[PDB]
Design an enzyme around this catalytic site. Structure first.
Site, short mmCIF file in Angstrom:
data_model
loop_
_atom_site.label_atom_id
_atom_site.label_comp_id
_atom_site.label_asym_id
_atom_site.label_seq_id
_atom_site.Cartn_x
_atom_site.Cartn_y
_atom_site.Cartn_z
CG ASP A 1 -2.03 1.57 1.51
OD1 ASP A 1 -2.96 1.41 0.37
OD2 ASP A 1 -1.63 2.34 2.25
CG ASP B 1 -1.81 2.77 5.64
OD1 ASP B 1 -2.23 2.26 5.79
OD2 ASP B 1 -2.88 3.61 6.80
CG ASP C 1 -5.03 -1.54 2.50
OD1 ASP C 1 -4.37 -1.75 1.63
OD2 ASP C 1 -4.04 -0.02 3.64
MG LIG Z 1 -2.68 3.58 3.51
#
Ligand SMILES: [Mg+2]
Ligand SMILES: *[C@@H]1O[C@H](CO[C@@H]2O[C@@H](C)[C@@H](O)[C@@H](O)[C@@H]2O)[C@@H](O[C@@H]2O[C@H](CO)[C@@H](O[C@@H]3O[C@H](CO[C@H]4O[C@H](CO)[C@@H](O)[C@H](O)[C@@H]4O)[C@@H](O)[C@H](O[C@H]4O[C@H](CO)[C@@H](O)[C@H](O)[C@@H]4O)[C@@H]3O)[C@H](O)[C@H]2NC(C)=O)[C@H](O)[C@H]1NC(C)=O
Ligand SMILES: *[C@@H]1O[C@H](CO[C@@H]2O[C@@H](C)[C@@H](O)[C@@H](O)[C@@H]2O)[C@@H](O[C@@H]2O[C@H](CO)[C@@H](O[C@@H]3O[C@H](CO)[C@@H](O)[C@H](O[C@H]4O[C@H](CO)[C@@H](O)[C@H](O)[C@@H]4O)[C@@H]3O)[C@H](O)[C@H]2NC(C)=O)[C@H](O)[C@H]1NC(C)=O
Ligand SMILES: CCCCCCCC/C=C\CCCCCCCC(=O)OC[C@H](COP(=O)(O)OCC[N+](C)(C)C)OC(=O)CCCCCCC/C=C\CCCCCCCC
Ligand SMILES: CCCCCCCC/C=C\CCCCCCCC(=O)OC[C@H](COP(=O)(O)OCC[N+](C)(C)C)OC(=O)CCCCCCC/C=C\CCCCCCCC
Ligand SMILES: CCCCCCCC/C=C\CCCCCCCC(=O)OC[C@H](COP(=O)(O)OCC[N+](C)(C)C)OC(=O)CCCCCCC/C=C\CCCCCCCC
Ligand SMILES: CCCCCCCC/C=C\CCCCCCCC(=O)OC[C@H](COP(=O)(O)OCC[N+](C)(C)C)OC(=O)CCCCCCC/C=C\CCCCCCCC
Ligand SMILES: CCCCCCCC/C=C\CCCCCCCC(=O)OC[C@H](COP(=O)(O)OCC[N+](C)(C)C)OC(=O)CCCCCCC/C=C\CCCCCCCC
Ligand SMILES: CCCCCCCC/C=C\CCCCCCCC(=O)OC[C@H](COP(=O)(O)OCC[N+](C)(C)C)OC(=O)CCCCCCC/C=C\CCCCCCCC
Ligand SMILES: CCCCCCCC/C=C\CCCCCCCC(=O)OC[C@H](COP(=O)(O)OCC[N+](C)(C)C)OC(=O)CCCCCCC/C=C\CCCCCCCC
Ligand SMILES: *[C@@H]1O[C@H](CO)[C@@H](O[C@@H]2O[C@H](CO)[C@@H](O)[C@H](O)[C@H]2NC(C)=O)[C@H](O)[C@H]1NC(C)=O
Ligand SMILES: CC(C)CCC[C@@H](C)[C@H]1CC[C@H]2[C@@H]3CC=C4C[C@@H](O)CC[C@]4(C)[C@H]3CC[C@]12C
Ligand SMILES: CC(C)CCC[C@@H](C)[C@H]1CC[C@H]2[C@@H]3CC=C4C[C@@H](O)CC[C@]4(C)[C@H]3CC[C@]12C
Ligand SMILES: C[C@]12CC/C(=N\OCCN)C[C@@H]1C(=O)C[C@@H]1[C@@H]2CC[C@]2(C)C(=O)CC[C@@H]12
Ligand code: NA
Lengths: 40, 993, 294
Positions: B346, B687, B691
């Site tokens: 990410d 995070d 996700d």
């Molecule tokens: Mg992120």
């Protein structure tokens, strides 16, 4: 020898156990020594 | 919980009007709802709070640990032992209780292993519970025409809700009136900068429009009003969390390896049993006995101590990770990192820092770079010119943000600053290399300031001049470089002033495009000294008419800014690529920024090119170039929505540097699945909540600890409590090291299987006195052997592990036939021969020569024959011959330990020699010493021939296994030699594990 | 999978390899196992060279001799009906097997048998344990010595009318000299009468104090009429140096045995180099559970 050959049927297992234990103990100690040798 | 309706991309009613909205949910735009109506809806559909996770009693997970794949094999072994005991009890008298002891021991082993594994997962759960900090929150709702602050759990759909910069958006709102209200859509949509929320509609995609506020989002600056459109679990992040919880888990690679291992162990066990069953029936024995023989051989072919050894092996590598702040919730998730071959990462919050920082600065016709790293470990920018000082005064003065009270302890970059992001970055840079801004600001009193107009697109202000020799007035303005460029005629070069001829104007244009192409946001700072003769110290410049010269100012220099990546991000990405791990960027951010961050972290190696880059370098349309000449590709989310399965397979099959931009969480999940469809292991590092569906479906999820969301933190398998990215490299290294070590330990625990089964086989075929008893096999498998097998984990690398390519899952297994050929075929055979040697020696010294032992079991066992003639003619009672058989069991067990010495030494290294690696592993040395001390203790301690049935040995016997051990060492040493000199030869494809 | 890994026709592979591979592996294992066998055999031959053919190196696990008997009892119990003949057959068969080795036809000529004192005598040393002199000579032991239990008169040996016999025997030990207790004031009660120094006494009794009364008259038969073993039949020189050697025997008739009741009879030998064990119930003594149910 002859008639009184009684020793031909005896074995000092006691002394053998004593020595085998002394040796086992020593080996155990040495092991510990090697294991902790470095963290001091 | 319909998953397909949750897998679909979000839809909405954004494209409407304020009248249509109020007409659909029912609500007064100026008076809101009524209290009675509000409570009627509150009770009609439910509080605005996400559902709690599905709890889990502790006995349930304890029962889970008591089962599995390995523990199940041990369970069937115990069951078989008790079955054979019941048989022997109903068929004969004086049934030996051997089988019952072995069964209770196996059950105890399974219970102990379960207790240990469960305790570890509970430890991680407790330290995990210490992070959910939930402070109640109250929203501002307008009912019957009045403002009230009520708990977040009391907001319903339809009432009016007001927000203010600093508060959190309660539910999914529909903005009706805003006043310069910005919002932080980083967690949900992944937008690094604050998107302004306007009552008007702008894009067909609800995540892109500005007339919708989202759940869990925070209002950075401004105030706004809105009608609650979505509430409770029905919100966007509510559907995302529910989808995350409604996804399967999977089955790690280590588990599949253990399963195939048990498959082989059972294959050879049932083979030896059914074969010696037909053979025993062919030699005369009865059925009742043959059944016991079958069960005995099958149960004997089961490694009981390998379970505790494997559990400790896996546990050891986990504590190191926890020492470097890498915590794993499960126990097998420690190996998945080493087997990974494609890492999907990410950008916002994982690859970057999500914090705006001053990156580049323009002054004295020269681009200067500033340190944009967390711990400030870099290069300064030459703070010796006067130009920089003037720049510091412009930025430090023409700025209204100030650090939040009480931050005197945190560092200069991690403290809280009340204001916009750009002004915050400027304030931090000035406070970083120019000292306390509070004194720099009180050193020059601000007289008049003209705020930021949407037309002026510039912020200016006049302050007094602290020069004790000059009482004039200072004027400073800041804004877009084009507008500011159109308002100057001089340039502060190296301190002096100069005209604005086209030479520097073109250098300013190239500088603007240089900082712009870098994906950064650039601003311009300029100032001018007001003549105290035309504007005395007493004249007040009220902000009404043109009191200051808009033009003829002195431009000092540009100031860019952008969110920089974390410290160890480039190095870690490079390390992963070096290990053959494909790095693919997956983020829901703008492609113009994603591509820049990719090139800056190593995903898009410098030099590679995209189809658009080629079309731009050649000046030809994009439909003409061939897509095979482009190694790296940027796939947009909008285009990803309209792509078939084969197209995605080809995208991953032909492009080595892929970057998925503007991809929704559902699309992230689709990408992970597209990677798995081929056959590679996947690790997703993230995070935010977007996700969560990606971390769950991936083979292994890595969530950030400080900057991560609670949902993604609870749905992940590995947590980075320090937010360090180099930990990924450390993990991929440890995952391999513990793999080669598991192989070595398995071969060690499997080599002793032969010298523990052969005695019984020769007992039934050759009819000789029982060579290896049951309490000795137990003292070997669960005693001495445990410490060495555990020590085999502390073995260091032989060659560079961070250099070889990732292991192939379809061909390179954990337990192949090359191992079985060694443990069961060559080493175990020698150990069994050594044991039989010591056996025959003990029986030959007491009077039973090898020629008279074949054919004696019928009378050697009979309990009523008190006259058994030996090779010399002596008559031996039953108990006397039994004492000798027990002493033979004791010496057999000691012989096993003697050969295990050389087996542990030849198992220490798989290819390299002992004189190269070295005996630097202190644990292995301690294992050998303890292994010998335990055998001596079990034999020489008084009362053992009564409790465990082990008699003392005569000092000359202990030396009957030494030659076999040295031979084992020599054979394996020459073995590990031809492999080195002859790479790829017979010895390698035949004996190289 | 299932079919391919078994036989493919493009690479001409069977089970995984081609024709020449199975040969390389089979040949390697044949040579390896052959070397293994040769090494084990050599290490066993040096062993055979380390031991003597006329004497066991270690004789400590057989120092206190045992006391076995002629009948083969499954649980040291003798139970048989005086009516049903197919009840004591297992006993007579064994007894007969034991006495069938003392047949006079077997003991004949000067070699290798020698006539010894018809009355208990002292030890006899036929030299050392060597091959210098040929096969040593052992004393003859006649069947008839055992009077009512010999199978020569009443083949059954007693079991026919409620009067069974029990032939006791001392475990053969190489170079073992039996030594009896001396005439000093300390000696069991029983042993005082008939102290023939040259006889090792054997005396049976009842395990419990109650059973005394229910056990009748223990009538022992032996060499010279004594209840023991003559010292002249020792020592034993081992099979290799004394094949065709006969060990003394002692018959015991349990006359006047109470009917329909389990009787525990413990027989015990007395002597210096004789010691009992609480774990081995056959070291020096022995137990029998007789029950003549009729
Ligand atoms: Mg992120
Ligand atoms: C050691 O001595 C054993 C006894 O020797 C006998 O007595 C000594 C003192 C000498 O006089 C010697 O010459 C005697 O023979 C000797 O065992 C004996 O072997 C013979 C030959 O097989 C047996 O004779 C056979 O008897 C059966 C029936 O036996 C019944 O009684 C015995 C108990 O005595 C039971 O065990 C049986 O189950 C029976 O209840 C006859 O049926 C059989 O018939 C055969 O001979 C006739 C002619 O007579 C033929 O017409 C037939 O066709 C048969 O061929 C024999 O008559 C004798 O029973 C047996 N005695 C005992 C007690 O078992 C033993 O072999 C010697 N061992 C060595 C190593 O020297
Ligand atoms: C083994 O030992 C026994 C017992 O020995 C005696 O006790 C020992 C512990 C030790 O103190 C010895 O010194 C001691 O003698 C031997 O048998 C004993 O032999 C004597 C002698 O015949 C017997 O004594 C007799 O007792 C009779 C009544 O009980 C008495 O009428 C006898 O008269 C005879 O002697 C007198 C002189 O005293 C003489 O005038 C008579 O004309 C007649 O000859 C005689 O006193 C003991 O009773 C015997 N003991 C037992 C238990 O029977 C035994 O011979 C010996 N064996 C060997 C091989 O040495
Ligand atoms: C690098 C790794 C280092 C590892 C070191 C480990 C430490 C070893 C620790 C201890 C070992 C020493 C043991 C000594 C014990 C002697 C005790 C003793 O009194 O024992 C007598 C017995 C004889 O018994 P018996 O049956 O005859 O009488 C029985 C008579 N009753 C029963 C009637 C009494 O004898 C015996 O046990 C014999 C004892 C065994 C003899 C030791 C042989 C050593 C073998 C190889 C080492 C060679 C080193 C060469 C140096 C190279 C330097 C470069
Ligand atoms: C950080 C530093 C750490 C250092 C720690 C050091 C620890 C201390 C080290 C060594 C201590 C040595 C103790 C020696 C004991 C000798 C006992 C002994 O010789 O007893 C022998 C006799 C039994 O002979 P028997 O006639 O029945 O033989 C059988 C004859 N048949 C069968 C033919 C009839 O004893 C008897 O009668 C009476 C026995 C009474 C019970 C004694 C208990 C001994 C048991 C364990 C102690 C040993 C531990 C050693 C450490 C090992 C670590 C792994
Ligand atoms: C009293 C006397 C004492 C007796 C004691 C006996 C102790 C028993 C000792 C050892 C047990 C031997 C049992 C057989 C072990 C075979 C190992 C095995 O099955 O491992 C499994 C492997 C799988 O391996 P992977 O996962 O790497 O495959 C990957 C394939 N991918 C990647 C292409 C898909 O499957 C394979 O190897 C394929 C299967 C090959 C099976 C060969 C069968 C040979 C068995 C006997 C031959 C006897 C002939 C004697 C006559 C000789 C002529 C003179
Ligand atoms: C007839 C009887 C048959 C018995 C058969 C079974 C035998 C099995 C038992 C022992 C086998 C011993 C094999 C000896 C191997 C020695 C290898 C050696 O010496 O290789 C030298 C290494 C290499 O150094 P480098 O150049 O990489 O250093 C670089 C340093 N830099 C980085 C600073 C430059 O140096 C190092 O490993 C560092 C120093 C390590 C010193 C190890 C000494 C301990 C050795 C054995 C322990 C004894 C166990 C006894 C078990 C019995 C218990 C009762
Ligand atoms: C870093 C941490 C270091 C810690 C190291 C700890 C090391 C501990 C070292 C030593 C302690 C061991 C336990 C001591 C046992 C003393 C037993 C004892 O003194 O017995 C003496 C009497 C024997 O008398 P007697 O000769 O008259 O019998 C004649 C019997 N007739 C004539 C009928 C044959 O005993 C009897 O009677 C009854 C015998 C009772 C049997 C007890 C044996 C226990 C069995 C299994 C436990 C062993 C597990 C292994 C643990 C390893 C730990 C490392
Ligand atoms: C970290 C390093 C650890 C090292 C430790 C070594 C691990 C050991 C692993 C497995 C061994 C355990 C096997 C248990 C064997 C029990 C044997 C048993 O129950 O035999 C029953 C005997 C009956 O015999 P009989 O019929 O001949 O009697 C005839 C009596 N007449 C004739 C006079 C009437 O009764 C007797 O012996 C009575 C005396 C009872 C003795 C119980 C001894 C229990 C020993 C160990 C259990 C605790 C171990 C826990 C440590 C785990 C380590 C991971
Ligand atoms: C008490 C316990 C005693 C145990 C003693 C055990 C001693 C027995 C040791 C070895 C005997 C086995 C020798 C077998 C020779 C026939 C094997 C054969 O037919 O092989 C053919 C290949 C040549 O074919 P290629 O590779 O060119 O074709 C390429 C084909 N493709 C692609 C499949 C690779 O051969 C090659 O590669 C050459 C490889 C030859 C194998 C070398 C292994 C040596 C191992 C140990 C010897 C050390 C003994 C030390 C003992 C000291 C005692 C004090
Ligand atoms: C054998 O035992 C019997 C008892 O079973 C003894 O004879 C008994 O003697 C008593 C007198 O003490 C009489 O009252 C009984 O009538 C007798 N019974 C029988 C069956 O005779 C006999 O004395 C014992 N004989 C020996 C030699 O011990
Ligand atoms: C690294 C290598 C070469 C070391 C080899 C060490 C060998 C020789 C050591 C390890 C343990 C030792 C045994 C430990 C205990 C006993 C019992 C004692 O009553 C006689 C000696 C005896 C039997 C020792 C003989 C020597 C021995 C077998
Ligand atoms: C290192 C390896 C390959 C050497 C193996 C050597 C083998 C072949 C040697 C070692 C000891 C040898 C044995 C030594 C003693 C005897 C006794 C004799 O009456 C017959 C031959 C026989 C049985 C030998 C046969 C061959 C033998 C087993
Ligand atoms: C087969 C065995 C139990 C299983 C065993 N080891 O189990 C450890 C699993 N790794 C070996 C034991 C023996 O050799 C001796 C076996 C015993 C079962 C019961 C047996 C078969 C008997 O009645 C007499 C021998 C006994
Ligand atoms: Na997972």
């Amino acid at each position: 020898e002859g008639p009184d050959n009684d020793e031909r049927f005896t074995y000092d297992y006691y002394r053998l156990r004593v020595v085998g234990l002394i040796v086992a103990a020593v080996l155990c100690v040495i092991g510990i020594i090697i294991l902790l040798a470095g963290k001091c | 919980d319909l998953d397909e309706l949750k897998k679909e991309v979000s839809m909405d009613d954004h494209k409407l009007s304020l009248d249509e909205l109020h007409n659909k949910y029912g609500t007064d735009l100026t008076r809101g709802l009524t209290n009675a109506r509000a409570k009627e809806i509150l009770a009609r559909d439910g509080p605005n709070s996400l559902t709690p996770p599905p709890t889990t009693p502790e006995w349930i997970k304890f029962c889970r640990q008591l089962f599995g794949g390995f523990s199940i094999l041990l369970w069937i072994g115990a069951i078989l032992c008790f079955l054979a005991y019941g048989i022997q009890a109903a068929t004969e008298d004086e049934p030996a209780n051997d089988n019952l002891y072995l069964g209770v021991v196996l059950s105890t082993v399974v219970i102990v292993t379960g207790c240990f594994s469960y305790y570890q997962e509970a430890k991680s759960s407790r330290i995990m519970d210490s992070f959910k900090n939930m402070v109640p929150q109250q929203a501002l709702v307008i009912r019957d025409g009045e403002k009230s602050t009520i708990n977040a759990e009391f907001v319903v759909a339809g009432d009016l809700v007001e927000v203010k910069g600093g508060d959190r958006i309660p539910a999914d709102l529909r903005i009706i009136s805003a006043h310069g209200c910005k919002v932080d859509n980083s967690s949900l949509t992944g937008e690094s900068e604050p998107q302004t929320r306007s009552p008007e509609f702008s894009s067909e995609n609800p995540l892109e429009t500005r007339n919708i506020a989202f759940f869990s989002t925070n209002c950075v600056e401004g105030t706004a009003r809105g009608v609650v459109v979505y509430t409770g679990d029905r919100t966007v992040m509510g559907r995302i969390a529910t989808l995350a919880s409604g996804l399967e888990v999977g089955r790690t690679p280590i588990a599949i390896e253990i399963e195939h291992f048990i498959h082989i162990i059972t294959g050879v066990a049932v083979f030896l049993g059914v074969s010696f069953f037909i053979l025993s029936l062919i030699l005369g024995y009865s059925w009742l006995e043959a059944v016991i023989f079958l069960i005995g051989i099958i149960v004997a072919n089961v490694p009981e101590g390998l379970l505790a050894t494997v559990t400790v092996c896996l546990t050891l590598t986990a504590k190191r990770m926890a020492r470097k702040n890498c915590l794993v919730k499960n126990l097998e998730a420690v190996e998945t990192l080493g087997s990974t071959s494609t890492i999907c990462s990410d950008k916002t919050g994982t690859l970057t820092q999500n914090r705006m920082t001053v990156a580049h600065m323009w002054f004295d016709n020269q681009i200067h770079e500033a340190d944009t790293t967390e711990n400030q470990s870099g290069a300064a920018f030459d703070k010796t010119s006067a130009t920089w000082s003037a720049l510091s005064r412009i930025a430090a003065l023409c700025n209204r943000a100030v650090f939040q009270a009480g931050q005197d302890n945190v560092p200069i970059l991690k403290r809280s600053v009340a204001g916009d992001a750009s002004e915050s970055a400027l304030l931090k840079c000035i406070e970083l290399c120019c000292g306390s801004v509070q004194g720099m600001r009180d050193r020059n009193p601000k007289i008049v300031e003209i705020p930021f107009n949407s037309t002026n697109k510039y912020q200016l202000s006049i302050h007094e001049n602290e020069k004790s020799s000059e009482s004039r007035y200072l004027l400073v303005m800041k804004g877009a470089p084009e507008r500011i460029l159109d308002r100057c005629s001089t340039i502060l070069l190296n301190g002096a002033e100069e005209p604005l001829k086209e030479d520097m104007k073109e250098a300013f244009q190239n500088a603007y495009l240089e900082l712009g192409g870098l994906g950064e946001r650039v601003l311009g700072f300029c100032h001018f000294a007001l003549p105290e003769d035309k504007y005395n110290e007493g004249y007040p410049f009220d902000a009404d008419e043109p009191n200051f010269p808009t033009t003829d100012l002195c431009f000092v220099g540009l100031m860019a800014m952008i969110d920089p990546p974390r410290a160890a991000v480039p190095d870690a990405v490079g390390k992963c690529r070096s290990a053959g791990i494909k790095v693919i960027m997956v983020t829901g951010d703008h492609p113009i920024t994603a591509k820049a961050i990719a090139k800056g972290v190593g995903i898009i190696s410098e030099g590679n090119e995209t189809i658009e880059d080629i079309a731009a370098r050649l000046n030809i349309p994009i439909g003409q170039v061939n897509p095979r000449d482009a190694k790296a590709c940027v796939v947009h989310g909008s285009d990803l929505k309209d792509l078939s399965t084969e197209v995605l397979d080809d995208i991953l099959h032909y492009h080595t540097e892929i970057v998925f931009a503007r991809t929704s969480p559902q699309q992230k999940l689709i990408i992970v699945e597209g990677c798995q469809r081929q056959g590679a292991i996947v690790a997703v590092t993230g995070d935010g909540v977007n996700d969560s569906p990606a971390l769950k479906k991936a083979d292994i999820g890595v969530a950030m600890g400080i900057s991560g969301s609670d949902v993604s933190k609870q749905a992940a398998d590995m947590i980075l409590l320090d937010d360090n990215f180099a930990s990924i490299v450390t993990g991929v290294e440890e995952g391999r090291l513990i793999f080669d070590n598991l192989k070595k330990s398995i071969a060690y625990t499997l080599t002793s299987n032969i010298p523990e089964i052969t005695p019984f086989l020769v007992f039934i075929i050759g009819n000789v006195p029982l060579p290896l008893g049951t309490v000795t096999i137990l003292c070997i498998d669960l005693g001495t052997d445990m410490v060495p097998a555990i020590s085999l984990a502390y073995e260091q690398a032989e060659s560079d592990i961070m250099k070889r390519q990732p292991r192939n899952p379809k061909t390179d297994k954990l337990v192949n036939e090359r191992l079985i050929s060694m443990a069961y075929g060559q080493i175990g055979m020698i150990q069994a021969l050594g044991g039989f040697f010591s056996y025959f020696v003990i029986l030959a010294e007491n009077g039973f020569l090898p020629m008279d032992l074949i054919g004696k079991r019928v009378r050697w066992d009979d309990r009523w024959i008190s006259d058994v003639e030996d090779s010399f003619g002596q008559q031996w009672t039953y108990e006397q011959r039994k004492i000798v058989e027990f002493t033979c069991h004791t010496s057999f067990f000691i012989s096993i330990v003697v050969v295990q010495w050389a087996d542990l030494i030849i198992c220490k290294t798989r290819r390299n020699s002992i004189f190269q690696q070295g005996m630097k592993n202190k644990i292995l040395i301690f294992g050998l010493f303890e292994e010998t001390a335990l055998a001596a203790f079990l034999s020489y301690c008084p009362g053992t021939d009564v409790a465990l049935r082990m008699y003392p040995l005569k000092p000359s016997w202990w030396f009957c296994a030494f030659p076999y051990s040295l031979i084992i060492f020599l054979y394996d040493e020459m073995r590990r030699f031809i492999i080195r000199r002859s790479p790829g030869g017979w010895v390698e494809q035949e004996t190289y594990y | 999978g299932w079919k391919k890994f078994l036989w493919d026709s493009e690479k001409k592979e069977f089970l995984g390899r081609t024709g020449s591979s199975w040969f390389k592996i089979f040949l390697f294992y044949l040579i390896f196992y052959g070397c293994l066998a040769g090494i084990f055999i050599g290490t066993i031959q040096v062993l055979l060279l380390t031991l003597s053919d006329f004497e066991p190196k270690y004789q400590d696990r057989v120092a206190p001799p045992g006391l076995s008997h002629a009948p083969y009892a499954i649980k040291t119990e003798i139970s048989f009906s005086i009516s049903n003949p197919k009840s004591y057959e297992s006993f007579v068969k064994s007894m007969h097997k034991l006495m069938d080795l003392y047949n006079e036809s077997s003991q004949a000529g000067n070699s290798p048998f020698e006539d010894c004192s018809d009355t208990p005598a002292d030890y006899i040393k036929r030299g050392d344990l060597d091959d210098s002199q040929g096969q040593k000579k052992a004393c003859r032991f006649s069947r008839m010595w055992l009077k009512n239990c010999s199978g020569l008169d009443d083949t059954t040996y007693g079991y026919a009318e409620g009067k069974p016999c029990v032939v006791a025997k001392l475990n053969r030990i190489i170079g073992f000299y039996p030594k009896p207790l001396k005439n000093t004031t300390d000696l069991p009660e029983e042993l005082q009468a008939n102290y023939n120094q040259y006889v090792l006494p054997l005396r049976c009794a009842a395990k419990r104090e109650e059973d005394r009364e229910k056990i009748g008259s223990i009538e022992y038969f032996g060499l010279g009429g004594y209840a023991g073993f003559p010292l002249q039949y020792y020592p034993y020189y081992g099979k290799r140096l004394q094949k065709k050697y006969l060990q003394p025997l002692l018959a015991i008739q349990f006359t006047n045995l109470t009917q329909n009741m389990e009787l525990r009879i413990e027989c015990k030998v007395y002597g210096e180099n004789i010691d009992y064990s609480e774990k081995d119930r056959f070291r020096g003594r022995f137990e029998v559970k007789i029950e003549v149910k009729s």
